[PDB]
């Protein structure tokens, strides 16, 4: 029993979520895999405000192994990119929250990068808090079920640090960019109510 | 006079292009900006062959300035990623070819990386030509107008090295992930015959 998602749906999800996200006032977006990149890119179009330069999106690939083992398959070369996580608001993007495992470590590893950058600059997060980095999360879908790992309480709780376009029942979702027959995929999606929901203007 | 492109169209363009591209037998994809990432990601779904691991996609941002000036805003950290361009077939992806300027330098800079990564490896493409790197290009659209830059002739000639989904006229194309009203954008696209061109199965 699959749930078919149309491109246009993913687009409207980002759209509505764009507003709530506008608070967190992100300084940059870090996208997990290609899965998180597509919505991240769309998400950007909506966060564009006249004059203000367009927010940057950094893609990262993260591999998790067992017998937990983390592996930075593709990471941000802060060096050559000249990216400073210090005192910035980072928004982590990925399509769906299943067991939360992925975001758990994604946040984790990125936090290490922040705190270690802070040292390198000679700063003390303790003595001078404001210098700390504020992390945010954004997912199209957040499955409601038993999560096999977890994200820090204060964030997971604040409705302006963790955004789930939609929270949905434990099922398997097929995303437009995965299908080898978009036409079928689409027809299905429309038949399950997974197409638009915000009529034209 | 804009040309509205639907997500589903971009999807089918990749689909058909997937075949011709299957020859070049790409070892990895390097995507220019988010623009090239979305189609690159889709393109992947179609290149998947049972058993064989899924091809990797590397995103890069390239800034070009004048008064030409190149700036690696975001590049591939071959180091930590453990990526070897030597003797591999790289496919460069980006949504549209306008003045070719972008791809000109994108290819250029990436070629430097291959060369320098080839020499410092203790090899020479002259005596051992089975090691040089073969570059490929893929764009949804390739506008026909007089270009401002240029790619090597042997590549822009061999129809198994330069892939352009649909070769379009000189106009301005609005891509789905750019629109702030997908519904309108879509209706328009369908009315210009810029939606699907292949049916279900
Ligand atoms: N297409 C699709 N991928 C899923 C689904 N649930 C999980 N995934 C994939 O599995 C990864 C694991 O997420 P986690 O379980 O660690 O929170 C996701 O990022 C995503 O790539 C689903 O319903 N549909
Ligand atoms: N949306 C859109 N972007 C375009 C169009 N033509 C060029 N661009 C943008 O301009 C860049 C310049 O490409 P170049 O002119 O250097 O070959 C493209 O990669 C793309 O981001 C168009 O018709 N529509």
Curated annotation (Swiss-Prot), chains A, B:
GO terms for molecular function: guanine phosphoribosyltransferase activity; hypoxanthine phosphoribosyltransferase activity; metal ion binding; nucleotide binding. Its EC number is 2.4.2.8. Optimum pH is 8.5. It is found in: Cytoplasm; Nucleus. InterPro entries: PRibTrfase_dom (IPR000836), PRTase-like (IPR029057). It comes from the Eukaryota. Keywords: Acetylation, Cytoplasm, Glycosyltransferase, Magnesium, Metal-binding, Nucleotide-binding, Nucleus, Purine salvage, Transferase. The active site is at residue 98. GO terms for biological process: GMP salvage; hypoxanthine metabolic process; IMP salvage; purine ribonucleoside salvage; XMP salvage. SUPFAM superfamilies: PRTase-like (SSF53271). GMP binds at residues 69, 94-102, 143, 172-178. It is an enzyme of class 2 (transferase). The magnesium ions are essentially bound to the substrate and have few direct interactions with the protein. It holds the Pfam family Pribosyltran. It catalyses: IMP + diphosphate = hypoxanthine + 5-phospho-alpha-D-ribose 1-diphosphate; GMP + diphosphate = guanine + 5-phospho-alpha-D-ribose 1-diphosphate. GO terms for cellular component: cytoplasm; nucleus. Its cofactor is Mg(2+). Dimer. Present with 36500 molecules/cell in log phase SD medium. Belongs to the purine/pyrimidine phosphoribosyltransferase family. Converts guanine to guanosine monophosphate, and hypoxanthine to inosine monophosphate. Transfers the 5-phosphoribosyl group from 5-phosphoribosylpyrophosphate onto the purine. Plays a central role in the generation of purine nucleotides through the purine salvage pathway. This is Hypoxanthine-guanine phosphoribosyltransferase. It comes from Saccharomyces cerevisiae (strain ATCC 204508 / S288c). The gene is HPT1.
